[PDB]
């Protein structure tokens, strides 16, 4: 039964390789049985013996002596040694991994209304995942008298079974997993909320640990069955348990993108905005004034604020004063937990500032306030990003006016050295470097001019007088807040594309003097394809090396476990700062 014959649609049966090698060995060995009685000459006797040897060497490891046997097709037959080794052998395909029950798969979508410990599950999948529990509860209440009756009742779905499904999953966790599964955070546990449709809804804050985005990703789901498994899922694998990395000491939940942009816009400051100069009784007055329409978020005002601090043993002691601030900062102050200073929001809040806020709240107050603070921050960011109407247009990308000078003068200098090549004065292998340096300097000048114009593009009339302030250009704010876009990408969008490289690795002498706003011509676009193809090819072929290295590292250390408390030894390692060249690369604090 471990080497069976499988029937087919027609009369013929599919056959296994082993039953062919076995029959070959049997016939070749039995041919010698009759020859013994006949007493054939030794000339025939010897040759058959060898024919037996190779036949056995067929049932055992094949291909180890050359000229591997084949069958009807042009492929070698697989022997017993082929059933134990390799990626398709028993060890790596049926014992260290396998296929399981009570599982499912679907596409994932974002759910912006969820709490950090919840996920959205389709009801069509759920009704089939939790079948035996529904059967048992149906038997409990007397709605059926047999397994077949319960199965038919579930199949011909009625309204009574949906309340049963609602009560079965009330406090039952599920596990979600994304396929590549690089660290242990690739599997987590959640509480399911029944929804309509066919896709799975996922919390925005767990995406970065999963490396997931909503452009076609899929996910798998599994259901624990025993009390021990449910308790392990609740106590060890729940998403509220995992907020700190195992590889280092950094938080793994962190807002990004629209949340960051909304909080950044909410906490900016302007000059001579509407409502400037008022004195307020507190954050509620600011909220009332802003929602009425009598004041702007960016107005500079005075508000009365009260804050709590650790007194001497974790007791909150209060202090009240007047503070110069803006309307938006006072409005945002209403979600900060009790115990943190007011100075932590009295500024423009970028990505790093928000991460620092979260870490400070985790250190001072603990775990339970931290998750509530994170969820409130996400709600506020999503709410206030929509109200701004932030957009992108073609006139957002501003091109400096002096660019047409900087390039032109550069084209003069490169010409001059060419004259020095007419009459022998410089080495023919030297003008290359000088031209490259000229082009690098010109690119630096153009980039500096572009950034200098873009960062202060706003000029403002305070009161009968002019002044400069940080601008509100969409691209600039998106780059400054840390939501999306590095400086080099802005360079490519509105500055200069720069110098490319040949496929070998040399530097092409003439740069691309166009950007992506004023488009490229045929030659520059053709030049820029080598780098793209090289990057894509490098990405496509070096995943296997990383996977192999990871498997080797896992194999060498899979058995190391903490087994005691103190061994008693006295040796160790001396720690010293890493200083090379003159700049201290690593201090003497984080290492110890």
């Amino acid at each position: 039964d471990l080497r069976p014959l499988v029937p087919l649609d027609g009369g013929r049966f599919a056959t296994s390789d082993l039953n062919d090698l076995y029959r070959r060995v049997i016939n070749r060995n039995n041919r010698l049985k009759r020859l013994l009685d006949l007493a054939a000459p030794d000339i025939i006797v010897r040759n058959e013996k060898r024919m037996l040897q190779e036949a056995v060497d067929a049932l055992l490891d094949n291909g180890r002596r050359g000229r591997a046997i084949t069958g009807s097709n042009k492929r070698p037959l697989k022997s017993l040694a082929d059933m134990i080794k390799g990626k398709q052998g028993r060890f790596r395909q049926n014992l260290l991994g396998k296929r399981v029950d009570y599982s499912g798969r679907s596409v994932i979508t974002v759910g912006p209304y969820l709490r950090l410990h919840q996920c959205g599950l389709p009801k069509k999948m759920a009704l089939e995942l939790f079948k035996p529990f529904i059967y048992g509860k149906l038997e409990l209440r007397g709605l059926a008298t047999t397994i077949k009756a319960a199965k038919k009742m579930v199949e011909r779905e009625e309204a009574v079974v949906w309340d049963i499904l609602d009560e079965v999953i009330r406090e039952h966790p599920v596990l979600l997993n994304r396929a590549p599964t690089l660290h242990r955070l690739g599997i987590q546990a959640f509480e399911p909320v029944l929804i309509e449709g066919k896709a799975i809804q996922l919390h925005p804050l767990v995406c970065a640990a999963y490396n997931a985005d909503f452009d076609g990703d899929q996910m798998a789901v599994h259901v624990p069955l025993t009390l021990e498994a449910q308790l392990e899922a609740r106590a060890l694998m729940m998403s509220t348990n995992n907020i700190l990395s195992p590889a280092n000491g950094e938080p793994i939940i962190v807002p990004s993108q629209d949340v960051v942009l909304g909080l950044y816009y909410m906490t900016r400051d302007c000059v001579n905005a509407k409502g400037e100069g008022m004195v307020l009784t507190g954050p509620k007055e600011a909220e009332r004034l802003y929602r009425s329409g009598l004041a702007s978020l960016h107005a500079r005002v005075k508000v009365r604020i009260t804050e709590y601090e650790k007194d001497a043993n974790g007791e909150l002691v209060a202090k009240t004063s007047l503070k110069d601030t803006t309307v938006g900062r006072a409005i945002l102050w209403m979600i900060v937990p009790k115990g943190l200073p007011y100075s932590i929001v009295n500024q423009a809040l970028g990505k790093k500032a928000i991460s620092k806020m979260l870490n400070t709240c985790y250190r001072i107050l603990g775990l339970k306030p931290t998750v509530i603070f994170a969820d409130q921050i996400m709600y506020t960011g999503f709410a206030y990003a929509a109200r701004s109407g932030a957009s992108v247009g073609i006139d957002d990308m501003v091109i400096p006016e002096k660019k047409h000078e900087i390039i032109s003068e550069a084209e003069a200098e490169v010409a001059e050295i060419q004259e020095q090549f007419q009459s022998g004065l410089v080495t023919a292998g030297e003008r290359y470097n000088k031209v490259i340096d000229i082009w690098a300097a010109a690119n630096d000048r153009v980039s500096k001019a572009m950034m200098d114009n873009l960062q202060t593009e706003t000029v403002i009339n305070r009161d009968g007088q002019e002044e400069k302030q940080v601008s509100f250009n969409s691209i600039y704010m998106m780059a400054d807040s840390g939501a999306r876009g590095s400086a080099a990408q802005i360079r490519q969008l509105a500055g200069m594309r720069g110098l490319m490289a040949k496929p070998d690795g040399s530097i092409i002498e003439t740069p691309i003097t166009a950007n992506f706003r004023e488009g490229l011509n045929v030659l520059q676009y053709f030049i820029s394809t080598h780098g793209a193809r090289k990057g894509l090819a490098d990405t496509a072929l070096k995943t296997a090396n990383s996977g192999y290295l990871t498997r080797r590292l896992v194999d060498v250390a899979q058995d190391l476990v903490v087994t005691e408390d103190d061994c008693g030894t006295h040796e160790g390692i001396m720690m010293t700062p890493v200083i090379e060249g003159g700049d201290v690369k690593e201090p003497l604090r984080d290492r110890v």
Partner: peptide, 15 residues
């Protein structure tokens, strides 16, 4: 440099 460097160290490769 890069991944080959670390794969060469962790395999105790002879220079």
């Amino acid at each position: 440099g890069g991944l080959p460097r670390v794969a060469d160290l962790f395999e105790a490769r002879r220079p």
